[PDB]
Amino acid sequence: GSHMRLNLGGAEVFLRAEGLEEAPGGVRLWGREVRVFPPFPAKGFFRHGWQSWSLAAWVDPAQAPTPLLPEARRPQADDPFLLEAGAWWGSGVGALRGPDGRALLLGALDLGARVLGREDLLLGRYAGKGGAWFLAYGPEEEVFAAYARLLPRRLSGRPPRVWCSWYSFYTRIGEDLLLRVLDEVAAFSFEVFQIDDGWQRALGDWEPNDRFPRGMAFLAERIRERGLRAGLWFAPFLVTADSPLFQKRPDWVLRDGEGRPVRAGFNWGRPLYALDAGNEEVVEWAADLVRKALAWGYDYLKLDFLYAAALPGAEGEARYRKAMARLREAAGEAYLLFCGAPVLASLGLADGLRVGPDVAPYWDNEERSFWLADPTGPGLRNALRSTLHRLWLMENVHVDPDVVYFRTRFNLLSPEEMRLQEALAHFTGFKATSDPPSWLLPEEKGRLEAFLAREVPVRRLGPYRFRVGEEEVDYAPLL
Amino acid sequence: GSHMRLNLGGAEVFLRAEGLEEAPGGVRLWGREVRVFPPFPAKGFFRHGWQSWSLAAWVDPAQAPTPLLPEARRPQADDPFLLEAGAWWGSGVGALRGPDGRALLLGALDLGARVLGREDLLLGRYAGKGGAWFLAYGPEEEVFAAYARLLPRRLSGRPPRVWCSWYSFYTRIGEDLLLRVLDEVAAFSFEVFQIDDGWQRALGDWEPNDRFPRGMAFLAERIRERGLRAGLWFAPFLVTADSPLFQKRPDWVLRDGEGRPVRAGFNWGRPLYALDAGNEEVVEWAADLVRKALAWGYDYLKLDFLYAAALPGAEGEARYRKAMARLREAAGEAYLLFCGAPVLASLGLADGLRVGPDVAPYWDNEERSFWLADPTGPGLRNALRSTLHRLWLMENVHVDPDVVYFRTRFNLLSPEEMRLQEALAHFTGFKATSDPPSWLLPEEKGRLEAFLAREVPVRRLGPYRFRVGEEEVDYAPLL
Amino acid sequence: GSHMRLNLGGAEVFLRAEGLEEAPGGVRLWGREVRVFPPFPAKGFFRHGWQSWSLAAWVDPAQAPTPLLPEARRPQADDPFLLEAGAWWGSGVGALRGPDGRALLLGALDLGARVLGREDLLLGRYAGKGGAWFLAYGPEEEVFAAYARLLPRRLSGRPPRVWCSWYSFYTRIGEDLLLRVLDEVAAFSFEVFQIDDGWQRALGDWEPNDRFPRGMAFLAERIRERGLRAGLWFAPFLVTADSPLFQKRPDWVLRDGEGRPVRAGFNWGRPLYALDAGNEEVVEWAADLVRKALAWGYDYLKLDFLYAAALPGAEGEARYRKAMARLREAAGEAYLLFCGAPVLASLGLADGLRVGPDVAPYWDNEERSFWLADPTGPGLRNALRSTLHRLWLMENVHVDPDVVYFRTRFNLLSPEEMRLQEALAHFTGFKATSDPPSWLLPEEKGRLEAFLAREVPVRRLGPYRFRVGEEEVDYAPLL
Amino acid sequence: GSHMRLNLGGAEVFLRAEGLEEAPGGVRLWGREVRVFPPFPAKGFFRHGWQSWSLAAWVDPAQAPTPLLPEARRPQADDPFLLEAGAWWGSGVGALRGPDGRALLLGALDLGARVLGREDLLLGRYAGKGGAWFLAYGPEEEVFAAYARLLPRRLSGRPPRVWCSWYSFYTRIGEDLLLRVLDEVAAFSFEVFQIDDGWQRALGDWEPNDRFPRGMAFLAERIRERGLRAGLWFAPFLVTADSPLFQKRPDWVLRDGEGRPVRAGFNWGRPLYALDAGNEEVVEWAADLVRKALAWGYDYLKLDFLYAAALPGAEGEARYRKAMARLREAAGEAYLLFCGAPVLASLGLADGLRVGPDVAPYWDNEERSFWLADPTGPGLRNALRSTLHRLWLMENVHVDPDVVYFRTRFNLLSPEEMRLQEALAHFTGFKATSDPPSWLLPEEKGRLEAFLAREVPVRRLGPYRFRVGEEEVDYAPLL
Numbered sequence A, B, C, D: 001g002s003h004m005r006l007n008l009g010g011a012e013v014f015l016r017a018e019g020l021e022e023a024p025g026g027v028r029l030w031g032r033e034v035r036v037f038p039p040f041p042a043k044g045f046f047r048h049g050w051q052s053w054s055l056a057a058w059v060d061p062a063q064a065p066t067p068l069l070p071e072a073r074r075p076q077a078d079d080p081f082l083l084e085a086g087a088w089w090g091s092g093v094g095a096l097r098g099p100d101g102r103a104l105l106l107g108a109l110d111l112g113a114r115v116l117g118r119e120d121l122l123l124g125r126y127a128g129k130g131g132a133w134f135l136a137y138g139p140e141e142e143v144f145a146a147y148a149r150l151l152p153r154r155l156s157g158r159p160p161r162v163w164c165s166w167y168s169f170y171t172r173i174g175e176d177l178l179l180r181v182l183d184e185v186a187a188f189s190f191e192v193f194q195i196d197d198g199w200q201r202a203l204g205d206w207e208p209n210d211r212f213p214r215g216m217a218f219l220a221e222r223i224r225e226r227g228l229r230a231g232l233w234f235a236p237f238l239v240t241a242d243s244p245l246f247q248k249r250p251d252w253v254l255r256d257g258e259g260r261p262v263r264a265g266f267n268w269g270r271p272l273y274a275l276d277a278g279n280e281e282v283v284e285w286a287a288d289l290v291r292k293a294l295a296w297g298y299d300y301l302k303l304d305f306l307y308a309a310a311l312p313g314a315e316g317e318a319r320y321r322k323a324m325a326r327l328r329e330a331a332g333e334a335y336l337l338f339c340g341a342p343v344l345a346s347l348g349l350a351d352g353l354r355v356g357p358d359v360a361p362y363w364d365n366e367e368r369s370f371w372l373a374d375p376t377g378p379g380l381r382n383a384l385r386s387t388l389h390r391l392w393l394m395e396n397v398h399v400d401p402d403v404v405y406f407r408t409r410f411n412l413l414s415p416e417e418m419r420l421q422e423a424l425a426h427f428t429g430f431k432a433t434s435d436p437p438s439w440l441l442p443e444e445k446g447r448l449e450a451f452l453a454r455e456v457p458v459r460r461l462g463p464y465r466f467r468v469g470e471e472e473v474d475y476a477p478l479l
């Protein structure tokens, strides 16, 4: 639309927008597409990925992006559009970095936007109908905090302290094994005992399998008989070809313009498919999973692979928001942890939000991060990189950096590496682990109990430097 | 739209169009697209190039068009569309030639139209919204003459006689050098002393450089103190990546739909870019250049590379014509010579129009003409060929065939070749040279003054046969 | 050459070869190429990899072989030929498996031979000039055992018990650290303390680095002062572009026919190159390294990346065997452990031979095994698989299955997985670990010493069933 | 073959050769292929083209060569092999440049060699049978002068002073026109009046055409009636499809292994073909051209396009030498100027040798040099670049830099540009022009007569700096 001139952060900025208003910290723009030109040579672009596991990092806009491999896995890495592109696109918000350490930020205030970054331009484009934008120029942390104020919030007190079954036993869980672990776990200051992936018969068959013979409502009662809330994991909108639901209700599968199932990724050794979050029947079967778990005794729910409800990217965020809005009301005031979730379109609905890739018992699988050009794989470095670039969302949701390791048995991480993750859990307030206590040395049990029981003050000094208690922790070598 | 039958030129012509009425010399059609069927086996297509340097010739529609190389130079050679297509498209007007030397001519009367030629069809397509057409069948000269009278005019008496700095010193000009030449030239019957490319600091920095220390107003006053008008050259809408304005106003660059600068070609050893001529702030800045030049004392302006204001082709003619309209008037009654310009969309705005490629001190550069298949390169043969096929515009504008050579020093043209170009200058009456008189032999100093200072009577007897004075110049060998 | 008929193993076998005579357990053939036709529908091909880390398994010859990725790593994975071909080729020996669990085995008795497998043919081709073959049909174990007895032996009593620095500290080793560990390790029933990769300044600069200030003779004397022999690791024929010797002696680099250095793969983040092992000046410089190490006080040498001396595959085995022959003897009666080595061309020269990929503190890296289709990467599953299919070499060399893990700290293996690897160490009798005892729990310190210090009796009952002590270890699930 | 160590120029040098002897200035090597490794990081490679027009220049061995276009023209640019290659090959001699301004030179002493240049290697490879090499390390000018001493010589006094018809009239010559020019030319101190291309009926029809009605023996008599030797131009081994000879003797055409004519280039608007210099009939018909011209009165012969006798490159040099050996004896002690000739294989037979591309009346046709990546096209810069890098041959033949311009009429060159060429004619002693005296201004006539009549002392200071008389001329900006 119209060419406009503006004074922002003591700089002259030129832009193209259909309308412009004032706003706290910067300005409000309107238009299906807006173009914002930096008053400097731009050295960095803030490339914000789409969902939890997606790369969030400052990148060189000059050099070209590297294709992520294998193609089967892109639907579970990012917005399919941001990866097929030969240019640098991001989801929702972008930012260019001036030579003085300040950032020109362009951020959507409605669903379904993307931002393009070149060294001379920030271009915002709504996939569907137009919408509002926020534009700001200033120090890096102020412009991101100013942007966060203008998005939905949902801050439910302080985030609980969770013991999570995933990052030790993975899918090899079982009612007998978790009963024993529950006994040792209840001696520590946790608030929630969360069962992760491994209890269900199949994706879409969310009923206990052979290794949970007394069902899920039994387990949750023993968990609360120990003064602990019971948490359960679902991938509500995910399905495989082998799932009974996929053949019993073929009209529930999300299909493209030719009726082929939309590809949703590759995991558990199998191609993944999505249930159609636009189908009101499906959204109800999904909300019914929430209430079936609440009836079972669980008041903490880990809703995973949530990008499947928003495929194929920006274009699907409006369906996604409608569908998670219904699950949100079905859950009442149960805790909802969004995982693999479209990050910005979850604000206001989620209670905690995973903001990076899976931690893992290792720093980096170089085969996946480097040879396959996939920074969304499990790994402590991949986890930390994106989480550091999403902490500005602590204003809007409990930010989940993922679990913290204290064990050295059955873990390749170094003690220095482990303290980097521990320090972000302090900073966000989100404290979880998957460490079985019988895997902890006595020295390590004590670190875990001190970690849960004390609120350690922590301060941000710069983008990668923190003061945790009185230690100074620096993350800048990581990148 | 509708199918129609017609008696045109005593033959029966089938045509498809939305409307039809009578017109001096043929008929007017209406329609975004129109189709005309020749009542003969068409043996030639008149392929009319977009801009001054584009090819304008009769072509064999049977044989395919050769790609022009290198690809980077295509935007400065023609409408990009006419060079990507695998068929014969023309800009504005096309014609089919019968076995009796008569032409079936279809020509747009509004901006933004191309014409396709096969031996069995003339198709006319407006890029933008629809418009009117002129269809006519008769002798070659009358149908083109008839077409001309329905297009805008601006015939401002007789064209001035110009001494031009380009075709001798190229960019290696300076204040002291041109003062020395001004002294020599002022002894001949010139009316304009015009400083060409070479005085400016950079494209988009239209202020004098280190070799014009006393500035450009000084130089105009020195020129007027000899009874001459002062001419100046601009390329207003052209810009390079190293130009200061490309960095200081990146929002003025003409960008495609993903924010990339659209390429305007390759000259002065660098890639070329365009300022956006639909950006009203750009048009007034360009209009200001005209005012600054008038204020400096110049009342003859060579505006060059004007295609850059009409990229990406027929689709840009609307934005172009308006931007040139604002220039046409900041100029008042100054003389505007249009160079590298969309030919038909300039009519009624220019006083003078280049209609062929640059002349050069040589007949043809076979490496660019043949091996790179680029007939828009500098060369006397290239220049004559497009000029001869656009003489029919002489009642709409001063038709500039480019400068005439009289020197044999620092020139590879033969005498026979030089007198072809002289002849066309007599015919159009646009008389210009670049020869420094100190480079001239006493013989040649005489022919130069003989040429400038009496009006030789000149007659067209064929498409490529001419009687100038009494000389029967025949241009049929060259094509 | 000639067509032949034969009674082998009570079945009638057609074969083509230049010569034939009797042999213990089958027949000897002669010929540069020989062809053998199975008297059955062959349901499996034994694909024998070239070097220690190459794949050695039974494969379905019907289904095509998957390309190994990335291409840069192919020279360190196998004979380059076996990875470029679209058929199933093996190194030295192949076998076809009948429906009755019996094998038709063809195996070269000289250097430089490959064996091709289809379900209808065993073809054996010498790369260089011709040689002799062993053909045999019978039970799987006896034909491989029979093949073994015709190849060179060097069985030097019992294999020493080694503490190895690699699978705990990797390259981050130093004098002070290994002194601390030497103290802890010297309390267990080890015989060799072996310093692995990490002491050297660079590949081809085999002098101590900044972290071994007192040098390597010092460290050997400290090791012997505890009643241990001192081991040292070299990669003698490997070199990187930044290695000083790559610059100071460019004539020692192994070059192709146009003078380009032949690539040896990609490790330590850099491209790998080879020193030319047909360059006698190189072989003596490499022989000098052995002498220098003996002079320093080391009498156990792990010679690694030995494939670099045999590039580009079967064609290099002649140059390799001679270069290893000169090393075998500068070593005198020192113990030579061959790693990354051409398996069959090492026999009679090595005292010990790695026969599988590296073990790792994890079962499998699915990104390298599956998605990059590289079974030569580090991993316990990869290690067991090639080791089980080369146990038949135990009467020719000490068969090293790689180190055994007892720690659970800094290790992702399960206990069940660890005892698979322990079992194979008992079976071969090659006992080694890398666990720093300070990393061990009191339980694990006990099993380590139990493991080192009494000889457990061990029996093979199947190809993948074993009785170690009394445990009936079954390896059939993993393949 | 054998690895050898050597002390050369006070440096240790390593090489691979079959034999080594001592030799003045360096050493003599033997072998079909030799490899020489620099004792420094190499910054430049001396890439020596094959024939007169071929590029001779120092190049960056690190960056890749650019394909020369169009493919039709490669046979007349260089050895077809040096252009098809993805590496840097040269004809006959190569050299690597140390950081101190010294050169390691490897040069063939027999026919049909090429030299490869990498930053770490100089590789010599004889196409046919093996041969001798010269190897030297030292200052750049000494090693090239040392190499030249070991090649054939033929120094016939001082080179004549020639007036040549080519670089003014080109093919548009004629007996009447040249008679007039002969009259003005004889007033100056020339020794030879040479008729160039344009007198013959066709390639292979070496008889006077319509514009020489009194034949060639007439013209040569009038030339000597003015005290001047008469010189004539031939392309003896060249033919086009249109030539009477090409159809009358199809068995004379040089054909490949399928009987197709070998492509020899593209000139005079037509594809070029070669007569087979291996065919003894052809070599005689060619020697007969020499004697037919001597019978006519001409004692100076310009034998052009001589690469056709040596196609397809190094492999054809032995035929070429045999065939020019016969023409050399047929010519007796007539002067033979070799043009378009294989440079090193002509030594000993030619009297003067063109060592670079055609001069032209312009500095550079950027369309051919840059867009078509063809530095062998006509042009003063292209001429100078190769000639400067071949002056070391003044020891072995009269080195022809090509004609010198003095006119400014019908010439685009600048006076500064013209003096660069004039200075190389002084330096070599080879003085020629094509300037018709009636095209010279009086000032310019006087420069020409002073140029012919005085021997100006000239001195080489460095690779690109000369002292001509007392002026210092610097060529280094050129490259």
Ligand SMILES: O=[N+]([O-])c1ccc(O[C@H]2O[C@H](CO)[C@H](O)[C@H](O)[C@H]2O)cc1
Residues within 6 Å of the ligand: A053, A076, A166, A196, A197, A233, A267, A304, A339, A340, A357, A358, A376, A377, A378
């Ligand atoms: O690289 N991937 O495609 C990929 C990333 C993460 C992942 O784990 C998610 O699912 C797990 C349960 O299956 C855990 O709940 C975990 O906490 C989740 O974040 C699975 C696959």
Ligand SMILES: O=[N+]([O-])c1ccc(O[C@H]2O[C@H](CO)[C@H](O)[C@H](O)[C@H]2O)cc1
Residues within 6 Å of the ligand: B053, B073, B076, B166, B196, B197, B233, B267, B304, B339, B340, B358, B376, B377, B378
């Ligand atoms: O790309 N080409 O084919 C091409 C480049 C430059 C050119 O010259 C135009 O700009 C010149 C100033 O630079 C002169 O004013 C000249 O009179 C103009 O016509 C013509 C053609």
Ligand SMILES: O=[N+]([O-])c1ccc(O[C@H]2O[C@H](CO)[C@H](O)[C@H](O)[C@H]2O)cc1
Residues within 6 Å of the ligand: C053, C073, C076, C166, C196, C197, C233, C267, C304, C339, C340, C358, C376, C377, C378
């Ligand atoms: O490319 N690979 O698949 C690969 C790289 C290294 C490696 O380790 C070998 O070298 C190591 C030292 O760097 C250890 O000594 C180890 O014991 C050796 O076997 C094995 C395989």
Ligand SMILES: O=[N+]([O-])c1ccc(O[C@H]2O[C@H](CO)[C@H](O)[C@H](O)[C@H]2O)cc1
Residues within 6 Å of the ligand: D053, D076, D166, D196, D197, D233, D267, D304, D339, D340, D357, D358, D376, D377, D378
């Ligand atoms: O770029 N080419 O392919 C090309 C180079 C030189 C050339 O000229 C040679 O032939 C001329 C006569 O035809 C003159 O004798 C001249 O002196 C010769 O050097 C012709 C073509």
